[PDB]
Paper text:
One family of these GEFs is comprised of the Ras guanine-nucleotide releasing proteins (RasGRPs) that can activate Ras or Rap, of which there are four in humans. GEFs activate Ras-family members by triggering the release of GDP and its replacement by GTP. The N-terminal portion of the RasGRPs contains the catalytic module that is common to other GEFs that operate on Ras-family members. This module consists of a Ras-exchanger motif (REM) domain followed by a Cdc25 domain. As first revealed by structural analysis of the Ras-specific GEF Son-of-Sevenless (SOS), the Cdc25 domain interacts with Ras and is responsible for nucleotide release, and the REM domain provides structural support for the Cdc25 domain.
We found that RasGRP1 and RasGRP4 are specific for Ras, whereas RasGRP2 has a clear preference for Rap1B. Instead, we determined the structures of the catalytic modules of two other members of the family, RasGRP4 and RasGRP2, bound to nucleotide-free HRas and Rap1B, respectively. Comparison of the structures of the RasGRP4:HRas and RasGRP2:Rap1B complexes show that nucleotide-free HRas and Rap1B are bound in a similar fashion to the two RasGRP proteins, and that the binding mode is similar to that seen in SOS:HRas and Epac2:Rap1B complexes. An intriguing aspect of the RasGRP2:Rap1B structure is that the linker connecting the REM domain to the Cdc25 domain (REM-Cdc25 linker) is ordered in its entirety. In the structure of RasGRP2:Rap1B, the REM-Cdc25 linker runs along the surface of helix J, and wraps around it by forming an α helix. The sequence of the linker is conserved between RasGRP1 and RasGRP2, but is drastically different in RasGRP4. The structure of the linker as visualized in the RasGRP2 structure is of potential functional importance, because it is inconsistent with adoption of the autoinhibited structure of RasGRP1 that we have defined earlier (compare Figure 6A and B with Figure 6E). A prominent feature in the active RasGRP2 structure is the formation of an ion-pair between Arg 131, in the REM-Cdc25 linker and Asp 177 in the Cdc25 domain (Arg 181 and Asp 228 in RasGRP1). This salt bridge and the position of the REM-Cdc25 linker reinforces the active conformation of RasGRP and is incompatible with the autoinhibited conformation. The positioning of the REM-Cdc25 linker in the RasGRP2:Rap1B complexes places the side chain of Thr 134 close to the side chains of the positively charged Lys 172 and Arg 195 in the Cdc25 domain, which provides a possible explanation for the activating effect of phosphorylation of the threonine residue, which adds a negative charge. The high sequence conservation of the REM-Cdc25 linker between RasGRP1 and RasGRP2 suggests that the linker might adopt the same conformation in the active states of both molecules.
Author numbering:
A (entry chain A): 8 to 387
B (entry chain B): 1 to 167
Amino acid sequence: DKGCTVEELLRGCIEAFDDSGKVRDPQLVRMFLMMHPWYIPSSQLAAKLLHIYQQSRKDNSNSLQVKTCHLVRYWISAFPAEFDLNPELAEQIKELKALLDQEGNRRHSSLIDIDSVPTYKWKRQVTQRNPVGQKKRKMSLLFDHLEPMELAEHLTYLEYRSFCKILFQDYHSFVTHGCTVDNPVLERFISLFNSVSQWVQLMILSKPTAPQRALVITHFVHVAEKLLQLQNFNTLMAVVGGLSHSSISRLKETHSHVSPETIKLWEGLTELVTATGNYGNYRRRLAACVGFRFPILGVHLKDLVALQLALPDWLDPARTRLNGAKMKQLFSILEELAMVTSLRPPVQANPDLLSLLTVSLDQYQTEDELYQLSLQREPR
Amino acid sequence: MREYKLVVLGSGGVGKSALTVQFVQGIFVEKYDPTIEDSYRKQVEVDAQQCMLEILDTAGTEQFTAMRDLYMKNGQGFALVYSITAQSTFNDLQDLREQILRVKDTDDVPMILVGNKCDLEDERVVGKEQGQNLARQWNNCAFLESSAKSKINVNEIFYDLVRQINR
């Protein structure tokens, strides 16, 4: 309950299984199997499971043996990416498999298989590569004639394709450091977020006359409306907040040319993602969602960082008893972030437009450059 | 009763979240939950006026530019916190101020310059005179030195912020 240690909690996770393999209370075992890197490295936890299995083997306790093997099986099936990525954890599982082949006589050895995992480690190491001298201004001419919904859909896909590459290790490193330090996957996701926002900014500042800029503002308001209809709150923030960047907000003359209906809908969307009330509107809408949903990562990262800094990991100075509340609260967030990968967005997307969109999102301008462009479009 | 939106900005190792939790939750936090609405709301009396303050902590959001711009747009007062043990954390506040001054087209913005971790005098690298001179340059705004651990000037941060808002 309150004041548990990693040994007691691991034993509790072992006891949670049945001799047949049935899991009695899956919430506890799912909690500890995801949350334990916060307190103990995964290789060390695997070593502890190994020692428990060996010690139970010496005492001929068949129940403890098969329960431990079922726990390891559930661990492998639930989080395979970590078993592929972590070499020391895989070595511990190798040693345990050898112990099963020796003492179990292949009775429980079939219960553990490490290459049944359809995983691609290099997915997180692979970075994109696109031709030089593209002059990919065709997207500029194209998005004017692009249906808003369609555009929204494609954006969703892109962001979702990045979000799935984030593992628990990345969330842990972020919350521990407060920022992305040696965290290229989450860094790439955040960079894509800001690339979407800056793309909105550039697409708006590209037009030379104020009514045209107001027209593209209306267009992006519609793609934000469709993102909300898509239940994609993350990219919504990307474009809505991109519509409120300093460079575009100070464009008073183009802001005169946007229709009042567009203004009403726009301020409604901005109110949806307000930080007032601790993002209460967003949290309520997300809770009311059914089916696929894309939460705005950054609100939940804010919650995780607040929990990490406010509450202590351990309750004793010896750092052996786990703060049960914190672990639960953190879990309640992270599991949600995990469940996002369970469902795919109901989105059709042709890869050609994906490529065009990625190439357009690639271009980077400093904040000062966009502000200078805004000054060119409308001086003081 | 008037409502105030106060946004807390700063670099990484400043402990602005520490000041926020110390202000709103106090020294004993016993049960804590940052995803609930009134976790950052505190009712406070300043200059005989009852006010409801909401603290917008940018704890892990400073890398999301859109969220930062919406913080700056939606925020009425801004507390730019630095750490007296790091010069870089002090220098990082100029760009933050400029971004606030760009989101709000004006130059006059309610703002307090805060030097946190003031109790660590043996590790101090930025003088009080630096913050005094900078706040004087920044339209002669409020300047304070505080310590979340030593409970120095925690409430005064938002007190003076509300004063600047009413000023």
